[PDB]
Amino acid sequence: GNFNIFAEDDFMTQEGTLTSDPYDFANSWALSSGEQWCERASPPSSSC
Amino acid sequence: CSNEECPGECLVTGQSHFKSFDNRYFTFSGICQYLLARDCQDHSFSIVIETVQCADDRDAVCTRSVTVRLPGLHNSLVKLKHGAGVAMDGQDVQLPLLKGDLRIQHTV
Amino acid sequence: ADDRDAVCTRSVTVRLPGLHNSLVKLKHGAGVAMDGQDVQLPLLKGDLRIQHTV
Amino acid sequence: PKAQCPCYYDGEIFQPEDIFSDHHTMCYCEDGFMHCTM
Numbered sequence: 001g002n003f004n005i006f007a008e009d010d011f012m013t014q015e016g017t018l019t020s021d022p023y024d025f026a027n028s029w030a031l032s033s034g035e036q037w038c039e040r041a042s043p044p045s046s047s048c
Numbered sequence: 049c050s051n052e053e054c055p056g057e058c059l060v061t062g063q064s065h066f067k068s069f070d071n072r073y074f075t076f077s078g079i080c081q082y083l084l085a086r087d088c089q090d091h092s093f094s095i096v097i098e099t100v101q102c103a104d105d106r107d108a109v110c111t112r113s114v115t116v117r118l119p120g121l122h123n124s125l126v127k128l129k130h131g132a133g134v135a136m137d138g139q140d141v142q143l144p145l146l147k148g149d150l151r152i153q154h155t156v
Numbered sequence: 157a158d159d160r161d162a163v164c165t166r167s168v169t170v171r172l173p174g175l176h177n178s179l180v181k182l183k184h185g186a187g188v189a190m191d192g193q194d195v196q197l198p199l200l201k202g203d204l205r206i207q208h209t210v
Numbered sequence: 211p212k213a214q215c216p217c218y219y220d221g222e223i224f225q226p227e228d229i230f231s232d233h234h235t236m237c238y239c240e241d242g243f244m245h246c247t248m
C-alpha cells in the first residue's frame with residue numbers, strides 16, 4: 001500500500017481506484033514471466 | 049513507370065497502433081469515442097470507434113465497438129459489437145444481409 | 157407429395173396491434189422475420205418473447 | 211465447456227479471463243458471470 005499516515009485509503013488498485021475487498025485489490029498486482037502464466041486466486045472455501 | 053492512384057487502407061490493430069491512409073504509423077491510446085473516418089465533403093458516410101482499457105494496466109487500451117452511419121440508407125446506424133454480432137437500429141440481425149446497396153456477410 | 161390429397165402448411169403470419177402494427181412471419185425452416193427483416197434469437201420486446209426450445 | 215464458456219453482457223459476448231474498465235465500472239468474468247463492480 002501507499003505510504004501516508006492515513007491507514008484507511010491504502011487499498012488503491014493498479015488502475016488508481018479504491019476498493020474494499022482485499023482479494024480483488026491484491027489480485028491487480030499480478031506479474032507474469034515467460035513460462036509463468038497467472039490465474040486469479042479465489043478465497044479458500046474451508047471453514048473451521 | 050506511370051503514376052496512378054490506387055486504393056488506400058487505414059488499419060487499426062494491436063492495443064493502440066494506427067496506420068494513416070497514406071503510410072504514417074503511430075500510437076494514441078486514448079479512452080473515449082473518436083471520429084475515425086468521414087466523407088467530410090459530401091456527407092456520404094461516417095465511421096466512429098469506441099475504446100476502453102483492457103488488461104488491468106496503465107497502457108493497455110482496446111477498441112470495443114464500431115458504429116457506421118450511411119445517410120444514403122435513410123439514416124442507418126450499423127453497430128459492430130465485441131463479438132461477431134451486428135445490430136442495425138437496435139435490432140440484432142442474422143447474416144447474410146442484402147439491401148439496395150448494403151451487403152453484410154460472414155467470411156471464411 | 158405431388159398427390160391429389162397431400163396438403164401441408166408453409167408459413168404462419170401473426171399480427172399484433174398492441175406492438176403498433178407488428179407482423180411476425182414464422183417460416184418453413186426455424187427462421188423468424190419481423191417486418192421483413194430476419195432476427196437472431198432470443199428476442200425481447202415490450203411483452204413479446206421468441207426463443208428456441210430444446 | 212465446464213467453466214470455459216463465454217461471458218454475456220449488454221449485447222456483447224466476452225471471453226473467459228477478460229477485463230475492461232471504461233469510465234464508470236471495472237468488470238471481469240469468472241465462470242459464466244461478470245462480477246462487475248463500481
Ligand SMILES: [Ca+2]
Pocket residue numbers: 001002003004005006007008009010
Ligand atoms: Ca497510507
